[PDB]
Paper text:
Here, a highly sample-efficient methodology to measure serial crystallography data from microcrystals by raster scanning within standard in situ 96-well crystallization plates is described. Structures were determined from very small quantities of microcrystal suspension and the results were compared with those from other sample-delivery methods. We demonstrate that raster-scan serial data collection within crystallization plates can be an easily accessible and rapid method of assessing microcrystallization experiments and determining suitable-quality room-temperature structures.
DtpAa crystallized in the monoclinic space group P21, representing a much lower symmetry than was the case for HEWL (P43212) and making it an important test system for the general applicability of this method. This protein was chosen as it has well characterized responses to radiation damage, with real-world serial crystallography studies published using both synchrotron and XFEL data. However, the increase in completeness from eight to 12 drops was about 2%, while it increased by only 0.02% on increasing from 12 to 35 drops. Additionally, the I/σ(I) improved significantly from 12.6 to 19.7 when comparing eight and 12 drops, while it only improved marginally from 19.7 to 21.8 when comparing 12 and 35 drops. Using these statistics as an example, it is clear to see that while adding four additional drops to the initial eight-drop data set led to a large increase in data quality (with an additional 20 min of data collection), the addition of 23 extra drops only led to a marginal increase in comparison, but led to a significantly longer data-collection time (nearly two additional hours of data collection). More amino acids, water molecules and alternate conformations could be convincingly modelled when 35 drops were merged (22 854 merged diffraction patterns), although these were removed for the 12-drop and eight-drop data sets (10 054 and 5360 merged diffraction patterns, respectively) where the electron density was not as clear. Despite the difference in merging statistics, the maps for all three were of similar quality, in particular noting the well defined waters around the heme in chain A in each case. The electron density corresponding to the Fe—OH2 bond is also marginally clearer in the maps from 12 and 35 wells (10 054 and 22 854 merged diffraction patterns, respectively), but this would not hinder map interpretation from the eight-drop data set (5360 merged diffraction patterns) within a screening context.
Numbering used by the authors:
A (entry chain B): 56 to 223, 225 to 417
B (entry chain A): 55 to 417
Write the structure that this text describes.
Amino acid sequence: SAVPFHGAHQAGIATPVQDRLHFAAFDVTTEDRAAFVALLKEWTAAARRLTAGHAVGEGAYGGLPEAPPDDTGEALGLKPSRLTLTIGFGPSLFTRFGLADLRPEALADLPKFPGDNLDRARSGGDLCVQACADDPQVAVHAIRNLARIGFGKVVVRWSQLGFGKTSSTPDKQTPRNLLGFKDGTRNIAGTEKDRLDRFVWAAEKDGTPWMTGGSYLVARRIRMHIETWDRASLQEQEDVFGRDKGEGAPVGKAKERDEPFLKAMKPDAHVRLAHPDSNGGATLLRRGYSFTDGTDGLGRLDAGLFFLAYQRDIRTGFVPVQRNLATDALNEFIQHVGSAVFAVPPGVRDADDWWGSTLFG
Amino acid sequence: GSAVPFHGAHQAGIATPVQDRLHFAAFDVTTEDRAAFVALLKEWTAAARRLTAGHAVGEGAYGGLPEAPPDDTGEALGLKPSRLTLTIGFGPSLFTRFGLADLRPEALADLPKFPGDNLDRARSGGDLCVQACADDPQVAVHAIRNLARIGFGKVVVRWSQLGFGKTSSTTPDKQTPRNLLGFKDGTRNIAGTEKDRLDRFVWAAEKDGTPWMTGGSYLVARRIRMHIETWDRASLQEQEDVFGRDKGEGAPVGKAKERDEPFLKAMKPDAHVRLAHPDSNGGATLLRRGYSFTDGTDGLGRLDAGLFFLAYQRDIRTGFVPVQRNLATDALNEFIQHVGSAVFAVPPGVRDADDWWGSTLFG
Ligand code: HEM
Ligand code: HEM
């Protein structure tokens, strides 16, 4: 299975969620606008090959023996695996190439939120590439080759491996986060065209014409205190979210997809504070992935949720909802340790178009 | 999605078909009570029976007393067994405890220092290890997480390593996976169907000198970083010369098919396959079962990439050690570096429902 690379929007936002994630933030090391635009065109050409299951350039072998292969070859024999490659532009990129007056107002800096413990090395970035696929080696291969093609012009600032469900699990079945709770029940679906136009896609009336058809991405590396969470009682765990753990139904209800009655939950339950009704209607497209990088020095599981949210405007999406989570009962068990925002440009229209063409011209 | 039988004369997860994901965890023992540690092995064995069958540990992930923490952490609820295997091993440092000194197998030999070693002592060693292999990473993480939670107060996680993809094959009938250098890895390994080769090279026999290890094996774990910047700027001929096989097909140099037998005299004298081939090491043969890993960036603008090398053998002294010694002149050494190491004695399998991990040692 493959996902079409071209379209009015970039794939990997409203398209079906893939099993694995390789998210990489890049810093730009060149000041030459012409050299960066040339890289964007080379990256788009490589992305077309990668999302179709082909090697980049002239291939991974069969070329001149004296030359290094254009493709590093670790994806040979694998399927496209629904690979999507989604590029975004960080705020720091607009301080380069004379783009200062073209930074959208919707690409706002995030305020400091209570409990933030952000790692500067795992935060920020001039640009990002979100690589989603059902095979993690397909996603890693894409990031590794894009970084190789960009060497000398970009460096990898930080990268994150993520996983969700293993589709080979019934789909429709809501996946569970590493806390044991169903995650994604009340979310914007890719089938909800109208809700995508209202809450996800940027329109030309929003004030930034080059972003029309694109979106804004908020990335948060949220560590979970697994060992602390696992010592809490089942009632404490269900009280934290407002949904039961077995079925995922809201409190007082029977089925997972029963619409919640917020007054029945505790006032600081996560769902009650994150619900659009508690936030002036602010609705988010959550497309995050669980992560487990290993164990820290104290033997604790370095695991959590790599939270990804797409929205029409950061000021009316993540910011008001995250601000409402200031008293979240979940805050006892999580800690945001990394953060980045990106303007995700519109999609590549056809074979002659390229990443970021509406911005650089 | 199916389950792998947990019981047997041997532990599963060695000759078993190699699953997609790996969660390897090394534990240190914090208790001096032998009876308490034996009770943990039985409690771990009961949990493994549930985990490998796709069932939650204990009384379940929910439905119990509201005021009590669930026995199962619950993040594997609604998932298939996903070919989950749990393989336990005992490190040499364990035998300094519980009066097990005289029971250390001679085949559980300390590895000598090899040229180029830069071993991080934090991510090395360990009293014991649990190799969790499954096609679903959430299933693998859930097993390690619940085993450690059951072991709270008696064991602590020393270090862990997650493998996002396999770089090995025990099933030559299936496509050989590729490592992060782009080459097929696992072409000439030991297959799970080759019973005679497994008895000769992998499983410990009673005549080897350690009766309680009969039916088990010996594991060598090596964390190997790859210099992918150095590798990616090397020419295709250089890359193929390093291994002795072409990159596209994986055939030995000069030959057409991956599984054609290597003609060692045609490769360079420092080629990896020529130096590691059993014919170059007095017949020494290994069961490789490693995985790729990438733990983010190196802080220098590059993806961190490596291979978590896992080797099972009948005797460390006659398996990994002579082969690794012969790789002293390996052309691959220019592109890799061993940064973590550990050896473990993998006990025999859990015979039936009454048996438990390590019962031949304790029991
Ligand atoms: C480790 C971090 C987090 C965990 C484990 C978590 C977990 C959950 C769970 C279990 C639900 C209920 C099931 C569902 O509808 O998805 C939920 C709902 C939701 N969460 Fe979170 N969450 C986390 C962080 C966040 C953050 C940082 C935000 C926004 C800033 C957020 C926004 C939402 C929203 C909007 C909903 C939908 C609520 C509704 O409309 O009913 N979550 N989350
Ligand atoms: C990053 C580290 C390594 C890489 C990338 C690597 C790669 C490869 C490749 C491409 C092959 C040829 C295909 C195959 O037969 O599997 C191979 C074969 C082999 N390797 Fe390695 N290897 C690594 C480390 C090691 C180590 C540390 C050992 C032993 C100490 C080892 C022992 C072997 C053996 C025994 C064979 C089979 C040779 C034969 O019988 O023809 N490898 N390896």
